[PDB]
Each structure stands twice: as structure tokens, then as C-alpha cells.
Amino acid sequence: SMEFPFDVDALFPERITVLDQHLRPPARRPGTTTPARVDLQQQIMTIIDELGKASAKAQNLSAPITSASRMQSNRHVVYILKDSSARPAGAIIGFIKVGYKKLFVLDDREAHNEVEPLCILDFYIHESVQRHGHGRELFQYMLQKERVEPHQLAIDRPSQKLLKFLNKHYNLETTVPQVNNFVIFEGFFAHQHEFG
């Protein structure tokens, strides 16, 4: 999939790496690798920049919606999928980016609600390996770490591929019409209904 000069496996030991505005390299014990020629955080910044550009090309966007500089100035969390057993040994498969956002969301009565749901903001799997289950790997990992259910999410400008994905995997089919270009599904307001 996506190839980089520096040692990705040394940088990201785990299959899925979780980063936020700090862009902090995963933990490592002193001595377990020689200090790289490129600082670890610079490697991370380059990876985020390139992933965001690739996602923008996939989505036919004139500018990336994910980048190192945007990560540093926002409250977003990115989950990055890498294959530790890739061949030939070196690569990054893709990522999902989420964040809580304050939104004014319409309910099924067309009334406005001030809410702060977890939002799906950017999501990309390299073209060569789309439709192989990697998107679901990332999505599931994120749901588990964030402790949220699919119907509780808002989606920023979902693509056709993502709408199909959400219906297939999570039975998210029926939307509640919005004016803010986010999409929500039936069940979005269930928690508000129960708890207030």
C-alpha cells in the first residue's frame, strides 16, 4: 500500500496506532532502536500529511481535510492501520479520523438540537486493498476504544462508498435529514430520549 522511506515498523509497533494533537510517537524503551535520522515526530507528521493527501485524491477534494498541521490545531484522533507482516518487508494501509464536534442537529420533528456527538471526519483505505475488510477492522477498533455505538455517530459528508459500508456492517440505513452537511441515522437521539 502506502510506502515511506523511514522505518514504519520501528515507529509504529502495533497494527493500529492511535494519535491525537500531540502526534506522540508510540512508547519505546531506550536502546530498542537507534535514534533515527528523521526525528520520530517528523516521521509521524509526514505520514499524516501523505495519508491526508491520498484521502483527498480518493475523495476528489481540492485540499486535504487531514494533515499534520490540522491535527496539531484540532481535537481529532486518528487511527492508523499498518501491516506488520507485509511483503516485501519495508507500509501503511489507511486510517480513520474522528472527533467530538458541537453541532446543531435536526431531529425527526425538524427541531434543532445542540449536541456534541463523536463524528467520523475522514476515512481512507488504499485503493489497492479497498473492499478487503480493512475499513471494518479500523472502524471496529475505533468503536471499541471510543466506547460508542454506530447509530450514535454523526458523519461529515459521507461518500457513497461509506454509506454502503455503514448500511452493510451496522444497518445504518435511514437518515434524519440535516442542513449542516453531517449525516445522522435513526437512533441518533435515542440516548437523549432515554436520559434527557
In three-state secondary structure terms, 41 is: helix
Choose which of 51, 103, 155, 172 interacts with ligand ACO (CB under 6 A).
155
Whether residue 132 is annotated as binding a ligand: the answer is yes
The closest of 103, 122, 86, 95 to 7, measured between CA atoms, is: 86
The torsion angles phi and psi of 144, rounded to 5 degrees, stand at -65, -45
Choose which of 36, 61, 162, 176 interacts with ligand ACO (CB under 6 A).
162
- Mind giving me the DSSP string for 82-148? E-TT-SS---EEEEEEEEE--EEEE-TTS-EEEE--EEEEEEEE-GGGTTSSHHHHHHHHHHHHHT-
Q: Among residue numbers 30 through 59, which ones bind Cl ion (CB under 5 A)?
A: 58
Q: Which helix (H) or strand (E) holds 188?
A: none
Q: Which residue is nearest to Cl ion (CB)?
A: 70
Asked if 28 is part of the footprint of ligand ACO (rule: CB under 6 A), the reply reads no
Residue reference for cell 425538524: 110
| Stretch near Cl ion under the rule CB under 5 A, chosen from 2-10, 98-106, 139-147, 183-191 | 183-191
CB of 177 to ligand ACO, least distance (A): 18
Cell numbers placing 141: 477498533
Minimum CB distance to Cl ion smaller for 58 or for 143: 58
Residues in contact with Cl ion by CB under 5 A are: 58, 66, 70-71, 76, 127, 188-189
Residues in contact with ligand ACO by CB under 6 A are: 58-59, 120-125, 130-136, 155-159, 161-162, 164-165, 168
